[PDB]
Design a protein around this ligand. Sequence first.
Ligand SMILES: [Mg+2]
Lengths: 212, 244, 235, 232, 231, 250, 240, 222
Amino acid sequence: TTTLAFRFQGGIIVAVDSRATAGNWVASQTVKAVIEINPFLLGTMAGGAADCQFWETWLGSQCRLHELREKERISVAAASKILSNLVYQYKGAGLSMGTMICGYTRKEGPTIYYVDSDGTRLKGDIFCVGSGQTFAYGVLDSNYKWDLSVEDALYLGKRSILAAAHRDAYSGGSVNLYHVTEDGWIYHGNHDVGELFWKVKEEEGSFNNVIG
Amino acid sequence: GSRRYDSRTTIFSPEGRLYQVEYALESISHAGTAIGIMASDGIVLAAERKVTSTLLEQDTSTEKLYKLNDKIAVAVAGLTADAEILINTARIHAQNYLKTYNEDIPVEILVRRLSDIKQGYTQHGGLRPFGVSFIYAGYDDRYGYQLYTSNPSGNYTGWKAISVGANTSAAQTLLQMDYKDDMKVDDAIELALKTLSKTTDSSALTYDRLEFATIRKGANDGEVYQKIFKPQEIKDILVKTGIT
Amino acid sequence: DRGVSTFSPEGRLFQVEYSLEAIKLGSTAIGIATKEGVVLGVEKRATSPLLESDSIEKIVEIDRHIGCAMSGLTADARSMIEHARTAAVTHNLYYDEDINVESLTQSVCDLALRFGELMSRPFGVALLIAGHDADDGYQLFHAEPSGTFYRYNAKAIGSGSEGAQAELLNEWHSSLTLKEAELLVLKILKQVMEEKLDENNAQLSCITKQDGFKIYDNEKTAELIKELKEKEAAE
Amino acid sequence: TQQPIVTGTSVISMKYDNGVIIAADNLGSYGSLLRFNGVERLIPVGDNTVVGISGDISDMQHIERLLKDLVTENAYDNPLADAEEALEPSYIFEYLATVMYQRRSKMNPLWNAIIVAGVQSNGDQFLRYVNLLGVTYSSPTLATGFGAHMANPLLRKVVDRESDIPKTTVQVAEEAIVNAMRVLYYRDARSSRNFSLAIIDKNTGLTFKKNLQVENMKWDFAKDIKGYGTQK
Amino acid sequence: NNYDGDTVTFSPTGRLFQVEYALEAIKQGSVTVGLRSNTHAVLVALKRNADELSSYQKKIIKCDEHMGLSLAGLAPDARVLSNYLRQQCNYSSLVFNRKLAVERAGHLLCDKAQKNTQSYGGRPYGVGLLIIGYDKSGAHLLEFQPSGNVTELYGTAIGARSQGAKTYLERTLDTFIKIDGNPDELIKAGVEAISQSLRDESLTVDNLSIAIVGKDTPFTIYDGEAVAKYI
Amino acid sequence: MTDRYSFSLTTFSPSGKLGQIDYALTAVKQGVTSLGIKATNGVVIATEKKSSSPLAMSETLSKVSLLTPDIGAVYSGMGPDYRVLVDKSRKVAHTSYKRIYGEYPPTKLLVSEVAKIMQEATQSGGVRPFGVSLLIAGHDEFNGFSLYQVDPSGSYFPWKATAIGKGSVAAKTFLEKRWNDELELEDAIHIALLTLKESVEGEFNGDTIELAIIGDENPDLLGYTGIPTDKGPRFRKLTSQEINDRLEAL
Amino acid sequence: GYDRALSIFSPDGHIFQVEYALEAVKRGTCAVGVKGKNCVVLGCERRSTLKLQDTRITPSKVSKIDSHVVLSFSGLNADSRILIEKARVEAQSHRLTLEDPVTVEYLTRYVAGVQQRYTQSGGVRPFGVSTLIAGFDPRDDEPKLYQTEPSGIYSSWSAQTIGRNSKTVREFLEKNYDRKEPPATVEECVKLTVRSLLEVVQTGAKNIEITVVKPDSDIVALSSEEINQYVTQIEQEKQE
Amino acid sequence: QFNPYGDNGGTILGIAGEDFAVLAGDTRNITDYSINSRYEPKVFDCGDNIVMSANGFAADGDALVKRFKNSVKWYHFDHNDKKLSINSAARNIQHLLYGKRFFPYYVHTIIAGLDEDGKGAVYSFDPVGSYEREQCRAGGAAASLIMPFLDNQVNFKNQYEPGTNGKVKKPLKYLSVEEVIKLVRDSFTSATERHIQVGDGLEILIVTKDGVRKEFYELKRD
Ligand SMILES: [Mg+2]
């Protein structure tokens, strides 16, 4: 698994792979590593599939109850903290979670919180989580700018997952792209890594080590 | 079942009064008068023991004045047994605070805590309230010398001079007449004894019918001393002030 | 004294019957169900002109597809609303779907008789629960402190209820439009209210399949009041 | 969590055309010590069910009491306790299976392997297995422990599938069971010669045979066996 | 009088007035009829509406595939008791792979209602129930009273004006018990029975509620146009 | 079941009276007279053994009880209430003191614990106050000899000498005339016997009078030798013969 | 535990314990709240039956729940402390979990919820307290003023009074407070609040307390002399 | 030490068609190297046109199916006999599984049926409740033998159109129920040859708008 999320001028880009493994055995190539908490909030899946799915679905229920009671959209700060405080209660029991809670509100602007099963809650501009995180970070760090266009930002996130999918054995399958705006997230399609790799190789001139 | 025998101690009257609190206050009005007077250089606590006997061992007796810690003392008016329950709780609270913060408990925080306990008995539990009114005499480095009172309702207020127990109306009028802001402890000692001497239901005010205490910075330098007066020392101050 | 869960010689629970009397003193709330949606309307009844009337919240959202209006001791409704909201959201969490309006109403009514010597007394408030689901379409329920709930084509609760219900008896038919229902609630509210009805002392709301539950703006309601006045002067 | 102390070995069983047969030896082992020689491990429940139990004997005696209590409880306020509302093999099994799985789920199992053999109200044969893990399964033949490895292969030669059941008589089934018990006596070091056998038939009912012995044993060929290779 | 303040108090003649007042709530309730043959058991219930805009209060509740009841009195109490029956039916199936006998279901309801009549703080149930079911001993009909008394019957009725239907069933006893293998005729007899308890109002399409259970018939409830056939 | 009396049975009346406490004091007033006198070198507590029947063995009924080796107690009022209070008092002397400090509590603090128990029966749910007044005599190293009275309310007062129960008013007047601060223990016993004779109707002897003292340490009653610091109990119950000997010099 | 249902319905549909709790509020000293264009002012009556009081240490009538919200009350003083403590704890709990201070409406809704709970819980009596809760929502300049009462109902007010003779001061406010143009400055708002209390108070000496709350956690209590200047100016205009 | 878990072997397979769905599983039950039963049903009709199988530790599998069937029953009681949709059943099973997150049901659960638009649906669960809607999913012992085959023959992975040489993929044409059953039978026939825990019998449950149908096929018994 490889998941990333970064803040930029046009909001947040979220990009993930689609592979799930049980040892060396590739269990799935079609897993959804982005959990659609609600129309405005996204969460990434890393570590425990069930733990992430279950509690981020639960998080959406808590966010919905909040806006019913307070008649106002929940902040990313408050939403992330509900999840982090929950998993902190279970600390030591064996939950496995590494997630980015991503949202775009009026008061905050585009916001990302890295939330983790040992209780960590970090606000940040760029996060990368998973077995292929180091590969994605390399492409991200060298090409990231705040003034990226939505088009170029989407490509950067796609290209960074591809970098991980190539080198990391446990990452691959397909790339899912999301763009988070103030009015909600927008899905930018599923991209098979097999087809994407050759396309990127030719158009970009990268991966000269690989024969195609 | 059991409902039949329930007096319902925590209900409002049609007028919005708490029956049991009001009746507990009626009980307290028959207790020996306790007076507290705050001066610039200390606090005085004076209190009348109720119709005593010659065979009562006075020097080992304590029914009115109690030490909560080295900085805070209380004068009691009402059921002595009820008071000792609360006093022990207050002593524990003061020590809990000292253990937690490594500083002596501020007077008001102690007073609020005890008053909140009293309040609870008027709102829930179905138990009778504590038939006790306290005068708190204490010192801390924030507000300096402080006098408070609390009653069975759990309401508390701050005072320059105050009385509880019997004849508080008469006592408060006398204090209001002769009290001044620039007053000193030695003057306050005299006022307290003179007020008791006039309001007492006894024929004459003597040493064996009194409990007396002072909280002074008359402790060598930058510290506070509590002085629970001995029977002979009460006898001397009665002669000094010209009452006997 | 006597038990809180005591039966009268007629076979009724004293406390439940007494809570019904408290509801009769409450401000009027009216609901009308149509095939285009369910309308909910309430009398705000501010005790003083200095009271900011938009803070009077007697119509409340339970979920996107379920709304609720109250009459009686409105403070008692808060925990009922909390439970309803929790039940609606919890069912969505467990079943990845909307909860049926009846099932929501039943869940609220389960709280009603949980009193004794649990809470110390019944609720002193009645609820009009309106909503939509795919199985039974647009629905309006009347949830009482007895634990009983009836489905209604139209229903009025509160102080002007029996006068309003008689009026709803004559006016309701199975072909009512949403617009017709809105005016009808306004008309009957105006009839039973002490003060003169306007956009500040009365509130409208509706639930439709498309847009879900919506509380009407004072500007939107003001237009419907003006439309009502003209059509009554039209004959 | 525990360890079995006093234990019973194989329980074997099979279906035949009109009912079921079940059998188990009368030994209570204490490790390698053949401590108790008169232990009944087949426990009848009514006239239509026999529960065969292997593994820990203290837990067997507990289960025996549960079944006895079950019969008492079923008779309470039950005018048809000896007729339409009598205990069925399927009721008795499901109860035990519930208890076994609950006990393993509390990490405090009944250290047993159980086979419930019987005939239902409609005459249908009942034969189902349950163990300390709460694992259940049914088959034309069922056996626990060593019986699973040695008896099943023999019993499956008689009834290999469901369609072989109507073709199998009670004489053939009993013969196969008795032979299997002999084979287990030859080869299981925690077995005894003495055993019990029960037949539950839809026509002739419950026939419970005690104090049976393994007979017709072959040992004579042992005299010719000398040394371990080269000895003459 | 002085002995009706709670359920824990006998009167001087040995009566329990709170239980009797709970019994009174049933008499105020709408009429419901129960009857059975040797193959089937039928419930017929007259549903009551609040007014012309309101729905008709449901009277029949399914407890299992082979068992269910009709109610008269406090509906929320019927929901509590029917929920308890659902659980007990379910416990029997899950633990013992056994359908709960109707007679045993009656015993459980009796005992549950009894505890509320001997303890302080609580109150008796304010509802009467007619339980029908088909088990291993054939068709059954039970009558539950919140006093705890449960009775097995061929036929009965509870609610307001139930005496008319009960007398009719007492006359028809020999006829309707013989209606075997004919569900429609057994329901007809039940619809004719409940008709003896009607005044001013008659059986309409949203007024009538019928339930049936039998040999090869799961407990099913008929409402709306499904009962027009019997009007 | 469950104790459903979680509410106070003692409450303030409009006049500020706690009825149940007043009524408990009335029960004490009906009780047999008991008294206590403090001397310079000891304390004496005494009461009448009002035998309910002559067939009853009044020696088996102990009105004067040892609480600790240096503390004793006597009562007036309801005997059964006293008996259970003695059980509680003995236990609380261990649980709230001896098991903490490795020594027996001083008289005033044990009295304080007994007083607390009696106060709680005046406020706690579903109970009535204790229908007894106690007189507790004792000695401890730092306070010396002392005598305390404990009432149903939980209030306690230290006395030089006092009496409670039936003829307390007359007995207290008798004690006021005789008591001084120079009394030896034998003088206090003599005065105790004189005072007690006035309130007794029938037989007045060692078999009808129960008397104990808090005085010198009794190494003969310790039960072991070898530890110098352990010198024995100061509580000693006088025998029937010891009382009769002092009734001749009466 | 003590479980007795003290708050119950009567035949006429009234809960007398809740209604008698309102009678305790009627007895309490008068409290008044007035919101201007950019401020809220809380005025409180101090009964002058108690002199020889130490005003430094005596519990003040207006209490800060947080740095941006204040609470005043009429009714039982001891009861109010329990509500104030709970409100203060909840305010910090909200900051801890939501990472944002409470809105004035939220804090009001919480306190009102506590009050309601005590009207249908076994073994407890209702609070003999009505409250005025005032302040500004975080990063908001719109003044907020809410009222609660023993029953647990709450609502927003342009201006409101509670306690003894509150009928009289509400009469004053209803004719003197214009909604189209609220007190534009702190001065005007304080003046109108002091004027409203002068209808009821007696002497304008130490009997009137005034607390001004402005946006962004700007809360200050006026002193005797500052208030005395308002008292002086009001009556000098009145002599005409 | 007591081990509360066991392995009863078995292999299951769920395939979602255009307007149908199949859930197949072998009928063999084992422990270690012994056969417990040659016919012990593993795929169950749970009502509301839903079929289910919980493969792995059979005691946990039986418990879960039993609890889900019970959940279907109570869903009808609580929600006016409303039909439990396949997506709603899936979410419900997640909560059943996650309820034992710290003492899991040691099973791989698959359910099959039709969604609310009448299209074929399969849902796949891990032991602790994580789930996903899938087109094709094998579970159990021989899952690694079957899934690669299905990628190739159902999704036409690595297959390209002749002449184009890798430029044009083989188009994903819809499969009939008859075509799917052929792939299921061949999957289990192959799995039976190469996996010792697979064999004896194959029971397939087919789900359409008309209801649930069963088909049984023999497998090698060695
Ligand atoms: Mg094989």
